Design a binder for this molecule. Sequence first.
Ligand SMILES: Cc1ncc(COP(=O)(O)O)c(/C=N/[C@@H](CCC[C@H](N)C(=O)O)C(=O)O)c1O
Lengths: 411, 411
Amino acid sequence: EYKTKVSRNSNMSKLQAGYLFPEIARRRSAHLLKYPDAQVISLGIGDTTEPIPEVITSAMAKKAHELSTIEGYSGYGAEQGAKPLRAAIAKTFYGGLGIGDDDVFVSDGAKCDISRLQVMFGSNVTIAVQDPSYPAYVDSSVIMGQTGQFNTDVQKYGNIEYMRCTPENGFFPDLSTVGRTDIIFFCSPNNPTGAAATREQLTQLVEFAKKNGSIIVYDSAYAMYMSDDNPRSIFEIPGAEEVAMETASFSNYAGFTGVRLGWTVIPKKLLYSDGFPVAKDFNRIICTCFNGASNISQAGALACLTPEGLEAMHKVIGFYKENTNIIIDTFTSLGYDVYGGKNAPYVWVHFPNQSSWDVFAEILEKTHVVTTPGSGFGPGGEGFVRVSAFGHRENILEACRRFKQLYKHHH
Amino acid sequence: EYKTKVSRNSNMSKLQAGYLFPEIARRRSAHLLKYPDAQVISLGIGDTTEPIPEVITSAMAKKAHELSTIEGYSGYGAEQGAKPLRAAIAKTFYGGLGIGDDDVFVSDGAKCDISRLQVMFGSNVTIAVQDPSYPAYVDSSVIMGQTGQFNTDVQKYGNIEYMRCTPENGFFPDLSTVGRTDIIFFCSPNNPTGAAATREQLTQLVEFAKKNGSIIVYDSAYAMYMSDDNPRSIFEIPGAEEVAMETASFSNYAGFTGVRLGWTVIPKKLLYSDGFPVAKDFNRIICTCFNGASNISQAGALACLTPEGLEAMHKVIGFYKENTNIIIDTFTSLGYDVYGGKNAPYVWVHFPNQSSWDVFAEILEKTHVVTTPGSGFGPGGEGFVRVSAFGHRENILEACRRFKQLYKHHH
Ligand SMILES: Cc1ncc(COP(=O)(O)O)c(/C=N/[C@@H](CCC[C@H](N)C(=O)O)C(=O)O)c1O
C-alpha cells in the first residue's frame, strides 16, 4: 500500500482514546446489535429530548421562508453574529455587568468555541481544569500541543493542572494547592458533578487568576439550571472583566443541541501581557476560521430572547429539573451517595469498589440504560457514574424503576 | 491598566493585517462617509444575492416545524453528519469514484473545514498554495504555526511554497519548479483566477503529490460552474485516493452563504508516513472540536440533492453564469485581458502596470463599485482585480455601464 511522506501530527498521537461521547454511542450501538429488541433508555450523553417550543421553531421557519424572497434573502452574515442577536444576548444575560454588544461573539455552539479559543491561545500556554470536567477542555489542549503524553499511572496528560474537586471539598478546589497556569477552564454548574460555585468561591477564583495573571474560560452552559442563589455569570464578580471570558449555549435551554447556537463573551479589559486585547485576536480567529452561525439558527436564538421565548425555555428547563429530582430520589432511596442534581440536569452517583466503566457496562447489560462513566471526565471521576436527566418523563420513570429493581436487594 | 501574564500567541502576531474581506468592508464604509449619497454596488466578496429556491427553503421550514413535535424532534446529530446526507453527497458528486458514505464529513462550511484540517495537520507541516489563491489557506497556516514571519520585500510568509499561476503558464503551476511540501492546497476552478485545471494538469498534480509524498487539499467549491469539459472532482484522477482529499460547499450553488453547509471527503487510502489513515484523525478533530452542522441546514442540503433541488441549483448557477458573461463582454469590449469567467462566477481582469489596491480604490472612488484587489490573494495577484458576478441582474448591468464610462479612453 502507498503511504504519503507526511508525518502524522504528534499531538493527535498523544490522545489516549477516542472522544468520550462517541465511545458511549458506540457501546449503545453494540448493545443494540447484541439485543436488537432491547428497549434502551439513553441517559448517557446529555442530549435534550423534548421538542423545541413553537414560538422558537416558528421564527426559524419564518426565516427559512424569507430566504426564498428577494426582500428577505440574506447571504454571508458578520462572523461575530447579527447585531440584534448580540444585543439581545448582552442585555438578557449580562445587563448591568458592563458587557457591550461588541463583546459578544455568536457561535454554532460552546464546544466549537472551546476549540477556536484554543487555536487562539495556541500551543505555548498551560492550562488548568476541574477534575472531573467535561472532556473537551483537556482533549482540545492535547490537540493544540499544550500538553505532554498521557500518564497511565495517574490517568493524566502531562503539563495539565488537574484541580481536585471532591465531595469532601464541596467540589471546589483548594486553590492554595493549585499551580499557576496561563488558562483556567472553569465550568459552573460543573459537568459532571453538578456543583455550582458560590459567590465567595468565584471571588476566590477571580482573585487567584488576578494574582497569577491567568485567563479564566468560564463555561456557563448549564447556568439557567441554577436553583441555589449563586452567580450565573463570572462577570457578576468585580474584577472578572480583567481576567475572564465566558462561553455559553442555547443547547440546554431551548433544545438547540442539533440546531447549533451559542456565544462567547470577551470583555474589553482582558489583555495579554503585552497589553494586546484578547478579543481582537478572537475576532481574527472568527473572521479567518469561521463563517458565522447559521442565519436560521440565529433567528431562532433571537426568538428565544423575548418574553414568550424566555417563558418557553423556563418551562423546558423546569421539566428537566423535575426529571432530575426523580433520579436523585431513586438513587438516594437505594442508599447511594448522590451529588449534584440541584443546579444541573444530571446526577453524579458514587459507586465504591468498582471501576466506572465496569458499572457503565453492567447497567447497560442488565437494564438497557445508558449512563456515562465518571472516569470519562478525568481521573477524579473514577468511581462515579453520571446519569443525565434529559428524557421523556415516561423514560425517566422507567429507567428509575429499572435501577430500583436491579439494586434494591443489594445494592 | 491591569494586564494578564499570558503571552499573546506568537502566531497571531505574525499576521500582517486583518483578514482581507473585513478590510474591504472598512474601505467601503469610509467611501460611504465620503459619498453619503452613493449607490454602491458590491462585486467584491463573493456573496450570493438571489433567493434560495423554494423547494430547498420549504424543506428547511419543514424541519423547523418538525422540531416542535415529539416524533420529529432531534437533538445532537453525529458530528460527521446525517447518514442520508453523507450518502446523497457521496452518490451525487462521487458516484463511480469509489467514495463511501463514511468518507464524507458534513461541515458548516468549507472555510471552517480548511481551519479544522489545519488543526489536524498541525504546526509541523509545510504547505504549498496557488499564488494567487483564497487567503484562508495562507492565513490558517500562519495561525497554526506552519510559517515564518512575513517578508515585505517579496510579500510572502516564510516557509510557504507559493506556486505562481500566471497568464504565461495558463494559471497552472510549473510543477518542475515547485519545492516539496507536506500539503498542497489546490482550488479548481481557482479563486480568484477562475482557472479550471484540465484532466492532464490534475494528472500532473497527482503524479507530483505521489512522487513527493504530499497530501492535496482540493477545493472544489466552484466546480458546478464548470463549462469546459474538465474534471469536477480530484477523485476522477486515478491515484488521487492515495494523495488527496476534497472540500466543497453549498454556498455558491444554493445561496447557502448564510445557511452554512459544506463537506469534506477523505478517502480510505490516504495515509500518513506511518500508515495511519488521515480520515481517522479528521474524525477525531470533527468529534472533539465540532458538534455537527445545523440540523435545519442539513435538511436543506438533503433537499438540494434531489431532482427538484438539482434543477433549482442549476438555475441559480445558470443565472450567475449569465451575469459572468455580461461582465466578460464588458471588459473585453473595453480592451482588457480578462481571465476566468468561463468556469467560475467571477472574472480576473489584468490591470498591468498598476497596483491592485490602487485600481480597487480608483474603481470604488469613481464608479461606487466594490471589487477585490488581486494582491489580497497573494503576491501573484498583484496587477489584477477580481470582479464577482454575484448580483441582481440590474445591478450587474449598472456596474458594467459604470465600467464602460470609467474606462472608455483607455483603449
Ligand atoms: C460543560 C459543557 N460545555 C459545552 C457543551 C457543548 O455545548 P454546545 O456545543 O453548545 O452544544 C457541553 C455539552 N455536554 C453534553 C453533550 C456531550 C455530547 C456532545 N456531542 C458534545 O460533545 O458536546 C454532555 O456532557 O453530555 C457541556 O457539558
